[PDB]
Symmetry: C2
């Protein structure tokens, strides 16, 4: 439930560090959407794969990300995840996963900015 | 697109003022989830109907909040809506709609609090 999803997040978070986006795309749906940065979205597994490869080599001067509070709003088929990420300063994101027939939760909407996208 | 959803919001917003939750439940999915207030969620059309009937009076509507910026992250089947509501002070919510076979977008996750649910 709240764990397997939290385990998929980490699984992906790692798949990104190991720069093996080939295994990272197994967690995304085919028509998924990923918000790279404000006013910049990638649609489809291919476009999203490229986005990660592009923004692969980027880092913040002295920064220590840390998983924080995480709420899950499950509505049967889909699930809205509100993941807070601590910097030392926080980053509240909104992810949407959809459980396919196989029973594996894939990501459909990846907006690491959450409602911050508005402001 | 961005309008029909915005028109569904208003449609519901009104269905609530006219206290005719019978027509309001036509906009929600069957296994939908509604966040009434922090640490309080209603699951299923029935529970959600009761929730609205209960807080019919707890919340003084008529206080028509002003619609503001609204971002839509569509991923084929589902759609993540980031609606900002102005008070005069703002309220950034996160709604999730899913387009059924009939082609009508229903609400599956109604969290008028957005990422604020975390903090």
């Amino acid at each position: 439930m709240e764990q397997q999803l939290k385990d998929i997040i980490s699984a992906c978070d790692l798949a990104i560090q190991n720069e093996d986006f080939d295994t990272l795309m197994n967690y995304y749906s085919e028509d998924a959407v990923l918000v790279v940065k404000p006013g910049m979205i990638a649609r489809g597994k291919e476009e999203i794969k490229k986005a990660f490869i592009t923004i692969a080599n980027y880092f913040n001067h002295h920064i220590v990300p840390t998983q924080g509070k995480m709420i899950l709003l499950e509505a049967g088929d889909t699930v809205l995840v509100l993941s807070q990420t601590l910097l030392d300063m926080e980053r509240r994101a909104t992810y949407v996963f959809k459980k396919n027939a196989q029973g594996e939760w894939l990501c459909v909407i990846d907006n690491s900015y959450g409602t911050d996208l508005i402001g």
